[PDB]
Write a protein that binds this ligand. Structure first.
Ligand SMILES: CC(C)(COP(=O)(O)OP(=O)(O)OC[C@H]1O[C@@H](n2cnc3c(N)ncnc32)[C@H](O)[C@@H]1OP(=O)(O)O)[C@@H](O)C(=O)NCCC(=O)NCCS
Ligand SMILES: CCNC(=N)NC(=O)Nc1c(CC)cccc1CC
Ligand SMILES: [Mn+2]
Ligand SMILES: [Mn+2]
Length: 217
């Protein structure tokens, strides 16, 4: 019944918590990253890393700090890829080994309409027309935004480059899948070319969860 486990393969352990349990602490090496942060930010940072460390233990990796790189990206141990996300009512993480998968991204959002003006900032004109044609009963605008965030999180670890909202065209299928088509240069750091990603999505517990796994070559 866990949301991340429903949209990623069994080979990628995941862990999620819906509240901030009492008594958690960051590892000493992580404390400087949130020393001057408000309580809401300290709590999501600490709880998501407790989830990541649980998933890393399933891979046989013991307790390790998860620091942030120059573009805010989490810095995983050698031979590990992963992703983390937090929203009100959700903290989650997923990790995998580089010999099984190339990259993973996840994102969680509340299942509600986007705030005013956000859809115009994140969607291509063609995506807006596509969302209007989808069946009634799902907040397609919020699902599109969620899928764009997951696209960036799967892309950045492979390219080390920015990806704007206008740089990817996402097509959502009501069956719980989506595709992301990259509209800019897709040269990856390993010499290969990224052009498209396949994603999965689920709506449950008032939340939307999207995931992309970039598979082994
Ligand atoms: O969804 P959210 O916005 O919570 O994801 C935020 C997470 O994205 C991750 N992230 C931030 N920048 C990123 C990047 N360039 N590439 C991949 N993941 C990144 C971080 O782990 C962050 O959580 P943290 O600041 O607590 O480490
Ligand atoms: C496909 C285009 N999507 C993105 N480029 N998305 C992000 O940059 N998202 C983001 C933002 C901007 C909303 C701020 C802080 C941290 C992150 C990284 C998860
Ligand atoms: Mn967050
Ligand atoms: Mn997010």
């Amino acid at each position: 019944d866990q949301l991340i486990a429903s949209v990623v393969p069994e080979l990628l352990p995941s862990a999620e918590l819906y509240e901030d349990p009492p008594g958690l602490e960051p590892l000493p090496e992580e404390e400087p990253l949130i020393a001057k942060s408000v309580a809401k930010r300290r709590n999501e940072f600490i709880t998501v890393r407790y989830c990541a460390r649980q998933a890393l233990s399933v891979l046989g990796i013991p307790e390790v700090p998860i620091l942030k790189g120059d573009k805010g990206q989490p810095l995983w141990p050698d031979g590990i890829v992963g992703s983390m996300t937090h929203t009100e009512g959700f903290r989650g993480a997923v990790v995998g080994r580089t010999g099984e998968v190339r990259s993973v991204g996840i994102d969680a959002e509340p299942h509600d309409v986007l705030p005013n003006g956000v859809l115009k900032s994140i969607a291509l004109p063609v995506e807006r027309d596509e969302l209007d044609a989808l069946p009634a009963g799902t907040h397609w605008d919020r699902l599109l935004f969620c899928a764009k965030e997951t696209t960036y999180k799967a892309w950045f670890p492979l390219t080390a480059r920015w990806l704007g909202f206008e740089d990817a065209h996402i097509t959502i299928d009501p069956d719980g899948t989506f595709t992301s088509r990259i509209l800019v240069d897709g040269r990856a750091n390993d010499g290969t070319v990224l052009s498209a990603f396949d994603g999965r999505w689920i709506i449950d517990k008032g939340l939307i969860l999207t995931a992309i796994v970039v598979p082994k070559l």
